[PDB]
Each structure stands twice: as structure tokens, then as C-alpha cells.
Amino acid sequence: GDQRFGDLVFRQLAPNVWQHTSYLDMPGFGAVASNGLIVRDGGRVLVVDTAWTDDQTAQILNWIKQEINLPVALAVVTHAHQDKMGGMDALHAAGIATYANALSNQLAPQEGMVAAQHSLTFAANGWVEPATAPNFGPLKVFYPGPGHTSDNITVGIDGTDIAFGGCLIKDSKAKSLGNLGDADTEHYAASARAFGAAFPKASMIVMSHSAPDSRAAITHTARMADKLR
Numbered sequence: 001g002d003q004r005f006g007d008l009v010f011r012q013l014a015p016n017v018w019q020h021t022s023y024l025d026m027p028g029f030g031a032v033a034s035n036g037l038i039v040r041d042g043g044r045v046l047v048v049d050t051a052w053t054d055d056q057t058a059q060i061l062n063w064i065k066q067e068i069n070l071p072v073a074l075a076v077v078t079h080a081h082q083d084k085m086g087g088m089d090a091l092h093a094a095g096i097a098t099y100a101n102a103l104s105n106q107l108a109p110q111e112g113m114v115a116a117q118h119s120l121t122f123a124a125n126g127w128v129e130p131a132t133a134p135n136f137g138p139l140k141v142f143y144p145g146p147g148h149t150s151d152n153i154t155v156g157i158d159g160t161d162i163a164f165g166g167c168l169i170k171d172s173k174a175k176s177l178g179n180l181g182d183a184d185t186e187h188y189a190a191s192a193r194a195f196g197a198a199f200p201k202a203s204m205i206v207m208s209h210s211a212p213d214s215r216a217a218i219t220h221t222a223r224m225a226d227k228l229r
């Protein structure tokens with residue numbers, strides 16, 4: 001099922017949704033997979049997260065050209081770490097409009113990232129302010145609160161059973177919450193549960209560092225974060 005395309009992997013999740021996977025060596029972790037999404041919305045394509053590097057991100061765009069052959073209207077990136085924003089320059093070189101949490105754009109320079117062109121802001125309840133996410137189509141963007149990072153955001157795909165937790169959510173058999181160096185241990189558990197409650201009918205939970213899982217990924221991630229506070 002999985003399509004190897006250069007050094008990346010692509011997996012169809014639904015008629016209009018694919019997971020992109022790219023890898024980077026991290027001493028002490030091995031070659032770490034990071035997952036994002038590609039969504040076809042009618043005559044255009046929407047991307048969630050870059051790959052780790054510009055070169056890998058250009059390869060995502062090459063795959064889109066070969067397998068979908070429609071323009072990429074925008075990309076939204078889910079926090080200011082390299083696995084999610086490392087390929088911003090490749091998107092900009094391709095003329096793609098890019099979006100991130102305002103706080104991700106604020107943090108990007110100190111994190112070694114290039115900021116997105118546009119900043120999303122969020123209501124007190126976590127839902128994106130709609131005027132900051134124009135033309136997002138089926139992408140429903142939700143800020144669950146600080147957790148994996150202060151800026152992490154999540155995305156549901158209307159018309160599917162899919163919600164993307166990014167690096168906030170780990171799989172239902174995961175053993176650790178991963179990189180906690182920028183995390184908010186006090187609010188993580190609540191933020192994970194807020195993601196689940198924002199997308200209550202999503203039965204396929206996509207995440208950055210594990211293959212797609214059931215909603216038990218949310219309950220398990222929350223149950224592990226419950227131990228952090």
C-alpha cells in the first residue's frame with residue numbers, strides 16, 4: 001500500500017487524503033519518521049506540515065505533481081519544530097501560501113525555522129478565527145492548549161473520519177510522550193483531551209511519529225500525560 005517515492009513514503013488514507021512521511025537521523029533516536037497530510041479539495045491541494053528539509057518538501061511537491069497534478073493552494077504547519085516547519089523555504093520557492101499559529105511564526109527564528117507567511121489566531125475556545133484561515137476548505141484548525149509545545153495546533157478534515165494531532169498525540173501503545181523539552185507538562189493532558197473533544201467523531205487519528213491509530217491514541221496519550229502533573 002505504501003508508496004516509496006525517493007526517500008519519502010506516501011500512504012492513501014481516504015479518497016482525497018494521503019499521509020506524507022519523511023525521515024531524519026537524530027543521534028540517540030535513529031532515523032525518525034515524521035508524518036503530515038495532503039488533502040485534495042476539488043481542483044486544489046492542501047498540505048499539512050512540511051517534511052524535515054527543503055529537499056524533502058520539494059519531493060512532496062513532486063509527488064503531488066505526479067499523483068494528483070493540481071495546484072497546491074496552501075500549507076498549514078502545526079508547530080515550530082523542524083519536522084513540521086523545516087521545509088518552509090521549499091513551499092515559498094514554489095509560490096505556496098503558508099499558514100501557522102501566530103505563536104509558531106513568532107518562535108520560528110529562535111527555533112531555526114523560517115516563519116510562515118500568514119498567522120492564524122484562535123478564539124478563547126481554541127477554534128481558529130475564520131478570517132485568519134481563508135480558503136481552508138475542509139481543514140478545521142483547532143488550538144487545544146499548550147502541550148507538546150506552547151504553539152501546537154491540530155487539524156480535522158471535514159468529510160472524513162480523520163483528525164491530525166501532530167506531535168501532541170502518540171499512538172495507543174506508545175511508551176513515552178517523546179520530546180518534552182518545549183512541553184507544558186501541567187496542561188498537556190487537558191490539551192490532549194481537548195483535541196479529542198474538538199473532533200469527537202474522528203475515528204482515524206493521524207500523528208507525527210506513529211502510524212494512524214484509533215481514538216485510543218487520544219485516551220492513551222491523555223492517560224500518559226495525566227502522570228506528568
Ligand SMILES: C[C@H](CS)C(=O)N1CCC(C(N)=O)CC1
Nearest residue numbers: 032081082083167177178179209
Ligand atoms: C525534532 C522532533 C520535534 S517534535 C523531536 O524532537 N523528536 C522527533 C520525534 C521523537 C519521538 N520519538 O517522539 C522525539 C524527538
Ligand SMILES: [Zn+2]
Nearest residue numbers: 079081148167
Ligand atoms: Zn515538536
Ligand SMILES: [Zn+2]
Nearest residue numbers: 081083167208
Ligand atoms: Zn515531532
